Design a binder for this molecule. Structure first.
Ligand SMILES: CCCCCCCCCCCCCCCCCC(=O)OC[C@H](COP(=O)([O-])OCC(O)COP(=O)([O-])OC[C@@H](COC(=O)CCCCCCCCCCCCCCCCC)OC(=O)CCCCCCCCCCCCCCCCC)OC(=O)CCCCCCCCCCCCCCCCC
Ligand SMILES: CCCCCCCCCCCCCCCCCC(=O)OC[C@H](COP(=O)([O-])OCC(O)COP(=O)([O-])OC[C@@H](COC(=O)CCCCCCCCCCCCCCCCC)OC(=O)CCCCCCCCCCCCCCCCC)OC(=O)CCCCCCCCCCCCCCCCC
Ligand SMILES: CCCCCCCCCCCCCCCCCC(=O)OC[C@H](COP(=O)([O-])OCC(O)COP(=O)([O-])OC[C@@H](COC(=O)CCCCCCCCCCCCCCCCC)OC(=O)CCCCCCCCCCCCCCCCC)OC(=O)CCCCCCCCCCCCCCCCC
Ligand SMILES: CCCCCCCCCCCCCCCCC[C@@H](O)O[C@H](CO[C@H](O)CCCCCCCCCCCCCCC)COP(=O)(O)OCC[N+](C)(C)C
Ligand SMILES: CCCCCCCCCCCCCCCCC[C@@H](O)O[C@H](CO[C@H](O)CCCCCCCCCCCCCCC)COP(=O)(O)OCC[N+](C)(C)C
Ligand SMILES: CCCCCCCCCCCCCCCCC[C@@H](O)O[C@H](CO[C@H](O)CCCCCCCCCCCCCCC)COP(=O)(O)OCC[N+](C)(C)C
Ligand SMILES: CCCCCCCC/C=C\CCCCCCCC(=O)OC[C@H](COP(=O)(O)OCCN)OC(=O)CCCCCCC/C=C\CCCCCCCC
Ligand SMILES: CCCCCCCC/C=C\CCCCCCCC(=O)O[C@H](COC(=O)CCCCCCC/C=C/CCCCCCCC)COP(=O)(O)OCCN
Lengths: 71, 115, 105, 175, 98, 171, 347, 83, 122
């Protein structure tokens, strides 16, 4: 159940980032929305910055240092 | 985050105590009061002169024996491996070599202080 | 120079530690396990000279996984454009990107 | 961007390295190395290396106690030097400080390749992994694997330690 | 690369420069050697932690072990040097020329 | 280098399970006993596809089975279960061994009202088999074609022509 | 030093070198280097005196700096590719660091300064070990990573080594410093051909080791460390001086002696790669090594220097300890040119 | 027989700490090879499920793989409960 | 820089692969073997000379052992060297065969139709 929820949450975050990027970067002439940086077409586990790039600093802090700093 | 706050609080309290101790009382500092103490008299030499170490060899050996601690600390986690025989053999071998080092220095008069 | 005693005797003195995609304890995977696996299987048995050229795509993907330079560049470009559009007031971030989102498990 | 705690810690690390590399009296060099060891422990703790950081701090504390004793024995002078008691020491300290300042400025203000490569900074938090599983710590498991995977490493390390004891005894014999 | 990597590499460069430029005391150069080892430990630990290379987690500890040996070695030599000269100044080690 | 395809937000909607970790831990043994088939199908899809986008329907089935299980528990006896999970929830480590009377009551209730038997120690950690109609992925790694190897070494070994041929040496 | 302790130390040095040779992991190669240095420091200090202590200290400082640079190169290579295997470095900066570290370990110019001092400060046995066995591990590592060598830096260091070896040897009267400068020049010759053919490097190393062993054993047998002390050998053991003169001629690369075989081979190999100017300069420079070898031969065996009266007493005593491998080493140092094609067995 | 007896008596009279240390170390070296519970310790270590057991894709030719945890097939920790 | 050490199917530390048995062994009267024995004899004579013994006649068993050891090692050295040269020729011929486009056969003209420049000596 945790696995299914994690997949849904990650995919939702990535889709939200995709839509925001599509809205934001409409003016740049040679930019493809959602273009990958890998030649391979297989699934790549998202990096922290990709998931939390366009969010608040508090969410980023909780995502990065939340577990380590919890005591 | 909590540990940083605790460390800051402790250091701040100690520094504030030092500040109180140095700024609250009345100070009368003159050259005789602040002179070095040698129980009645002026020291003959400097306290910055070399001070011989008679246990220098044991001090060096402490450096090598301090890393056996690093090697032996992950033993509680190593005890959870499936191949317990190999892990036990390696741990016993490491401790045996440490004991052999201690015995070698002991029998070569390496634990006796210099005269 | 390199007397391969390990290969002659079949000992594995240090080959268990050479690569990231090789039998970690508890099956814990490396961050770039798939990319390294792809590159190693591409380059196996053809020699270094041929592997440098014919397996350059796999190695580039592996290095991108390792250091994430291109991803950081893309994220920086997106954020720079977002800041430029926000300073002139043409763009507004959505509520879920401002801390007022509806969380899900 | 997030509070740049790791950047501040690494800057203090570099400052301590400048402090003991300008070479004042070995008392203050040992103090600077102790500070650098503690701060590097903090960095590794922030990246998730609790055991490794704590162990490096402990090891360097013991080594620096031995170094302090040896400095009082055979590395003293009438007026031990501090970072401001010498033109050479102060010059080296200042040069290191401004060199770190220049490197940092050329790093976070623009993308330039100093020696090896270039980058933008952006704080460490970006390049994490968001791995979500486990009832253990991967660092502890990898370190504990030394007794099951690293038999060869244990053998060579123990041999080198015993040989080092024999070697120091041979060297300090004199005659 | 993060700015932390650059800071650690700069720390190693500073320690190497401090070792290569000698003042009188040999103990200071030994401390520079120890600082170089510490920076190497930090750099390797950060790389191995970031890449989640599990079996490499034992690599830094091994480094420390041999660091100790080197440290001990240096201190041993220092003792003998002092015993000959009453001082650890490197300018007394000039009996041999090129 | 191509466009990453992602499911729409409508595709990712599902009836979520909004019970806390203590409730889940209290129910976990019977939950793994009863809802094994969808969970195992989802996990097999997950470990064979190596792509979260290819196992969304299995995840939705997992959610549906969990909701049905909890609905049955709520329908038959929620008070023994509430006592059990409250006792579990007090502990800071959520230890099972501090709540054995409440666990006994909940186990008795489920056994008499539904015929649910708690799995014995060692059972839920077995490796099991899953019957599925999902075809086995042929290239889950999206691997490129492997470069051809160097041809081979073949033939019968003959002595070197005119020896070593190193300067004046005739052998 | 106890004989058992000395045997253990020599075995530890050799096992560290072999660990470097047989390892596939960079960490194990570094461990082998560390073990070799740790066990090798006491051997330099077996006979205790201030000069030996100074030589040991200088050697330790140089090798520790080299080891730290070595580890930094390894760590950078790991950073830019998650690899520990010693195949070929993936970063040019790491390659430069590794090349400089191995050059400092080998004593190539401009890292040559410690070699004459350390050789002069230790005994002839320690000098033999230092100038023969200590070259194997860095050369093996360099051979394994040869395809990643930047040819410009390696060739610059090799040419500098040849030139500086000749010029420094031109000025020496102590035999240990002469041997050290010969070692520097020969190491430059070894590393000049490394980016082209590692078999030539192995062959040069083998020939140089044989001739160095013969030279040092002849110097131990006639217990001389200066030119004027060696000028007395003819009045006690003329055969030793004659064999030494022939060995010195071989070390100068004169045909048809063995020492001509490596340079010759190296030269021809370089001409296969359209390298003409550099081999010519290297040979014309090795003329200097030949010159000071001929000076030593003039003082030692071709003319008769005045002797002392007490030498008569030495006429009444033989050598109680004999070196079993000296005749074979001399023969290999001189008469192996006709067996040149056997180098194909080395590849 | 008697020489070792006299040596042990002298050691016990002069260095009881060393005698106890050597005895404890020797027992620690020897005893594990003679114990029947070392195998039990290994089996207990193997029986701890740190990671998820990934199910196998059924192909109709595995009589010894369960289709459900409560099925009789597979390993059993019945021995562990009584241990 | 390392031509033959990475050859496929190479056992690490053999010194004599099995395929080397397909080659003719060197004759025991090989001139190279005779030179190896001569080297052993010279080593024996130098051994006599250094120890201050009658050079030509002191230890006959020692000279015999010197010569025998040198010949024994030289036989296997010659076998390995011959095998390595045979391997080089085999690989070269195979590579030439497998790449006809890099080693083309071009028709050769006779000297009656090739115009060569004449340089008078005067
Ligand atoms: C191939 C490449 C080219 C050739 C190689 C390079 C050539 C350079 C070699 C230099 C050798 C230096 C030397 O030995 O003496 C110089 C020597 C000069 O000596 P000298 O002037 O006559 O008088 C010196 C006296 O010895 C004064 O000293 P002493 O009075 O104390 O006499 C002590 C004597 C008397 O000896 C005794 O007392 C015997 C007592 C035995 C003690 C038992 C100790 C055993 C316990 C320790 C175990 C440790 C194991 C290590 C484990 C490591 C684990 C990781 O022992 C010795 O002389 C030294 C013994 C040498 C040990 C050799 C053993 C082989 C080592 C193998 C190591 C590999 C291990 C595996 C590696 C795997 C990887 C990890 O030079 C020569 O005589 C001729 C040179 C011959 C060289 C070889 C010839 C060509 C090759 C064939
Ligand atoms: C008792 C003697 C005995 O058993 O006689 C049987 C044996 C019969 O052998 P064979 O196969 O009937 O002779 C065929 C012809 O000699 C035809 O001889 P080959 O065409 O078979 O030549 C064999 C080949 C291979 O021979 C060698 O590699 C070396 C042989 C001697 C080298 C000469 C230098 C000093 C002597 O020789 C060469 O390639 C010429 C290289 C010589 C130049 C050496 C480089 C530096 C020169 C410095 C002066 O007589 C000898 O071996 C001749 C004495 C040596
Ligand atoms: C290329 C083609 C092939 C060529 C072959 C290669 C060259 C020749 C072979 C080289 C190696 C062999 C001999 C070397 C060891 C000898 C040791 C020695 O000292 O000799 C003394 C020894 C006489 O001493 P003794 O009998 O005990 O009583 C007199 C006292 O000892 C009183 O004696 P002492 O010690 O008191 O006298 C003091 C003397 C002691 O000083 C010496 O004796 C000099 C020894 C130098 C050792 C040679 C270096 C090692 C080999 C390298 C050769 C390089 C060749 C390349 C070209 C460069 C030439 C330098 O010191 C001096 O006078 C200072 C002189 C300094 C001037 C500079 C020249 C010195 C170096 C010249 C070396 C020339 C090459 C070797 C020629 C043969 C020399 C015996 O000479 C001999 O009797 C051995 C000669 C050979 C006889 C065996 C022949 C076999 C029997 C016939 C059977 C027929 C065979 C075929 C069968 C056919 C069927 C019928
Ligand atoms: C237990 C942990 C909690 C503790 C919490 C309190 C922490 C206290 C920290 C230390 C304070 C204790 C010291 C006792 C009173 C402080 C007196 C001293 O610090 O200041 C004096 C102030 O002197 C200053 O030099 C002159 C005052 C002018 C400078 C003040 C700057 C701003 C004032 C401008 C006026 C307008 C008001 C602006 C503020 C609103 C200097 O006196 P001095 O003789 O040397 O030292 C001996 C003091 N004796 C006599 C008590 C023994
Ligand atoms: C050729 C001459 C032989 C004698 C001289 C050799 C000189 C070198 C010293 C010893 C050689 C090292 C060989 C041992 C390599 C270790 C690896 C191998 O032995 O397997 C180990 C087998 O364990 C053995 O018990 C090794 C221990 C034996 C060594 C201990 C004492 C010997 C040391 C002697 C020399 C050291 C210095 C001097 C000490 C006095 C562990 O394998 P295992 O655990 O199944 O599975 C691991 C894989 N997993 C993780 C996936 C499960
Ligand atoms: C002064 C002249 C040189 C003398 C050299 C010393 C002679 C005595 C040495 C004792 C003989 C035993 C040596 C080896 C025998 C068995 C070991 C064998 O298994 O090793 C093989 C190797 O065989 C040996 O290397 C051959 C040694 C033969 C050396 C003699 C050639 C000298 C050149 C011509 C001078 C004439 C010499 C005359 C002799 C008296 C394995 O090959 P490999 O592991 O894959 O290669 C490793 C290096 N690579 C990968 C980088 C290529
Ligand atoms: C950790 C436990 C302790 C914590 C530390 C706090 C201690 C609290 C003590 C409170 C008691 C009051 C302190 C009074 C003593 C001050 C020192 C003193 O006696 O100075 C006398 C001095 C004499 O000066 P003159 O007569 O002009 O010159 C003669 C010499 N030529 O008189 C003074 O300076 C008066 C200063 C006023 C004292 C301040 C009182 C306020 C107390 C605050 C305590 C802070 C707690 C935190
Ligand atoms: C097989 C076990 C191996 C592993 C277990 C060991 C673990 C650690 C124990 C070893 C640590 C190092 C021991 C070092 C030994 C040094 C001996 C020595 O030289 O000390 C002597 C003292 O000891 C001696 O006399 C020499 C050895 C005496 C015997 C010691 C024990 C030997 C073995 C006996 C135990 C056998 C096993 C127990 C069997 C039980 C009986 C049935 C000198 O003492 P000083 O302090 O210098 O004197 C100053 C004041 N006068």
């Amino acid at each position: 159940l945790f696995q299914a929820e994690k997949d849904r949450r990650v995919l939702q975050m990535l889709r939200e980032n995709l839509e925001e990027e599509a809205i934001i970067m409409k003016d740049v002439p040679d930019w493809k929305v959602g273009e990958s940086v890998f030649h391979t077409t297989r699934w790549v586990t998202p990096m922290m910055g990709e998931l939390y790039g366009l969010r608040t600093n508090e969410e980023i802090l909780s995502a990065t240092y939340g577990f380590i700093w919890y005591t | 985050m909590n540990i940083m706050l605790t460390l800051l609080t402790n250091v701040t309290l100690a520094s504030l105590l030092v500040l109180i101790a140095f700024w609250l009382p009345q100070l009368n500092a003159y050259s005789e009061k602040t002179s070095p103490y040698e129980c009645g008299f002026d020291p003959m030499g400097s306290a910055r002169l070399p001070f011989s170490m008679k246990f220098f060899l044991v001090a060096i050996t402490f450096l090598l024996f301090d890393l056996e601690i690093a090697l032996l600390l992950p033993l509680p986690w190593a005890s959870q491996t499936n191949n317990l025989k190999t892990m036990l053999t390696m741990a016993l071998f490491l401790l045996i070599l440490l004991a052999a080092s201690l015995a070698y220095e002991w029998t070569q008069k390496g634990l006796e202080w210099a005269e | 120079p390199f007397f391969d005693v390990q290969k002659r005797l079949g000992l594995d003195l240090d080959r268990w530690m050479t690569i990231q995609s090789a039998e970690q304890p508890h099956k814990i995977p490396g961050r770039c396990h798939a990319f390294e696996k792809e590159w190693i299987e591409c380059a196996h048995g053809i020699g270094g000279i041929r592997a440098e050229k014919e397996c350059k795509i796999e190695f580039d993907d592996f290095v991108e996984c390792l250091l994430r330079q291109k991803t950081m560049k893309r994220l920086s470009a997106i954020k720079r454009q977002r800041d430029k559009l926000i300073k002139e007031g043409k763009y507004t971030p959505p509520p879920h990107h401002l801390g007022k989102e509806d969380p899900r498990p | 961007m997030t509070m740049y705690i790791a950047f501040i810690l690494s800057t203090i690390f570099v400052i301590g390295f400048v402090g003991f590399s300008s070479k004042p009296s070995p008392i203050y060099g040992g103090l600077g190395l102790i500070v650098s060891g503690g701060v590097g422990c903090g960095i590794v703790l922030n990246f998730g290396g609790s055991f490794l950081g704590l162990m490096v701090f402990l090891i360097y504390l013991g080594g620096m106690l031995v170094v302090f004793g040896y400095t009082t024995a055979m590395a003293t002078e009438m007026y031990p030097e501090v970072w401001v008691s010498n033109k050479t020491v102060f010059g080296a300290f200042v040069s290191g400080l401004m060199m770190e300042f220049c490197m940092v400025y050329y790093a976070l203000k623009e993308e330039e390749v100093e020696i090896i490569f270039k980058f933008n900074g952006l704080g460490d938090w970006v390049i994490y992994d968001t791995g979500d599983s486990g009832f253990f710590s991967e660092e502890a498991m990898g370190i504990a694997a030394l007794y099951s995977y690293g038999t060869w490493l244990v053998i060579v390390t123990g041999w080198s330690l015993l040989i080092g004891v024999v070697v120091i005894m041979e060297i300090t014999r004199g005659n | 690369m993060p700015l932390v990597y650059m800071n650690i590499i700069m720390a190693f460069a500073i320690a190497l420069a401090g070792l290569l430029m000698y003042r009188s005391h040999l103990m200071s150069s030994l401390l520079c050697l120890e600082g170089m080892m510490l920076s190497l430990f930090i750099m390797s630990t950060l790389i191995i932690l970031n890449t989640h290379f599990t079996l490499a987690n034992m690599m830094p500890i091994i480094l420390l072990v041999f660091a100790a040996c080197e440290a001990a070695l240096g201190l041993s030599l220092l003792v003998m040097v002092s015993n000959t000269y009453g001082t650890d100044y490197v300018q007394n080690l000039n009996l041999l020329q090129c | 280098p191509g466009i990453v395809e992602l499911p729409t937000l409508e595709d990712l909607k599902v009836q979520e399970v909004k019970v806390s970790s203590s409730v889940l831990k209290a129910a976990a043994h019977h939950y793994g006993a009863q809802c094994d088939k969808p969970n195992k199908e989802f996990m097999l899809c997950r470990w064979e596809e190596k792509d979260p986008r290819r196992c969304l329907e299995e995840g939705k089935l997992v959610n549906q089975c969990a909701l049905d299980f909890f609905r049955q528990i709520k329908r038959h006896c929620a008070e023994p279960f509430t006592e059990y999970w409250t006792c579990i929830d007090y502990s800071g480590l959520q230890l099972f061994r501090h709540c054995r009377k409440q666990q006994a009551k909940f186990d008795e209730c489920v056994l008499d009202k539904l015929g649910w038997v708690r799995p014995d120690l060692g059972e839920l950690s077995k490796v099991t088999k899953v019957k599925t109609d999902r075809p086995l992925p042929e290239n889950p790694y999206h691997s490129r074609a492997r470069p051809e190897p160097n041809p081979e070494a073949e033939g019968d070994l003959k002595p070197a022509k005119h020896g070593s041929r190193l300067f004046f040496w005739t052998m | 030093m106890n004989p058992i302790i000395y045997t253990t130390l020599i075995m530890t040095v050799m096992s560290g070198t072999m660990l470097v040779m047989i390892s596939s992991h960079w960490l194990l190669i570094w461990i082998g280097f560390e073990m070799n240095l740790l066990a090798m420091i006491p051997v330099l200090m077996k006979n205790f005196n201030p000069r030996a202590t100074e030589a040991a200290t200088k050697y330790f400082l140089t090798q520790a700096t080299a080891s730290m640079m070595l580890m930094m190169a390894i760590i950078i290579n790991l950073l830019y590719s998650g690899q520990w295997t010693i195949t070929k470095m993936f970063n040019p900066v790491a390659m430069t660091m590794m090349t400089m570290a191995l050059a400092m370990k080998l004593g190539l110019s401009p890292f040559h300064f410690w070699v004459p001092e350390v050789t002069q400060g230790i005994s002839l046995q320690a000098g033999l070990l230092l100038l023969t066995w200590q070259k194997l591990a860095p050369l093996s590592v360099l051979c394994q990573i040869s395809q990643s060598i930047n040819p410009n830096l390696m060739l610059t260091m090799a040419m500098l080594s040849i030139l500086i070896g000749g010029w420094g040897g031109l000025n020496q009267t102590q035999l240990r410093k002469i041997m050290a400068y010969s070692s520097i020049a020969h190491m430059g010759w070894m590393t000049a051909v490394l980016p082209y053919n590692t078999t030539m490097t192995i062959l040069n190393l083998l020939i140089y080791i044989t001739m160095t062993l013969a030279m040092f054993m002849l110097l131990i047998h006639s217990s001389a460390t200066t030119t004027l002390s060696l000028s007395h050998t003819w009045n006690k053991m003329p055969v030793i001086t004659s064999l030494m003169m022939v060995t010195l001629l071989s070390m100068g690369g004169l045909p048809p002696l063995s020492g001509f075989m490596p340079k010759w081979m190296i030269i021809q190999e370089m001409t296969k790669n359209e390298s003409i100017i550099m081999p010519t300069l290297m040979a014309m420079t090795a003329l200097l090594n030949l010159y000071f070898y001929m000076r030593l031969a003039y003082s030692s065996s071709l003319t008769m220097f005045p002797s002392t009266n007490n030498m008569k007493m030495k006429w009444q005593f033989e050598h109680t300890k004999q070196m079993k491998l000296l005749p074979t080493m001399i023969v290999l140092s001189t008469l192996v040119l006709p067996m040149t094609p056997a180098l194909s067995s080395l590849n | 027989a008697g020489r070792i007896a006299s040596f042990l008596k002298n050691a016990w009279a002069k260095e009881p700490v060393l005698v106890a240390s050597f005895a404890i170390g020797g027992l620690a070296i020897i005893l594990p090879s003679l114990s029947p519970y070392t195998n039990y310790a290994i089996r207990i270590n193997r029986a701890t499920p740190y990671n998820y057991p990934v199910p196998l894709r059924d192909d109709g030719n595995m009589p010894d793989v369960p289709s459900h945890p409560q099925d009789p097939q597979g390993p059993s920790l019945e021995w562990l409960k009584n241990l | 820089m390392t031509m033959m050490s990475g050859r496929p199917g190479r056992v690490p530390l053999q010194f004599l692969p099995n395929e080397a048995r397909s080659l003719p062994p060197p004759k025991l009267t090989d001139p190279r073997l005779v030179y190896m024995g001569f080297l052993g004899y010279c080593s024996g004579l130098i051994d006599n000379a250094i120890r201050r013994r009658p050079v030509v006649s002191a230890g006959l068993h020692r000279q015999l052992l010197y010569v025998t050891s040198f010949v024994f090692f030289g036989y296997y050295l010659l076998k390995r060297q011959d095998y390595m040269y045979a391997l080089r020729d085999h690989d070269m011929f195979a590579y030439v065969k497998s790449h006809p486009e890099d080693f083309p056969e071009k028709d050769k003209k006779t000297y009656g139709e090739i115009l060569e420049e004449f340089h008078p000596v005067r």
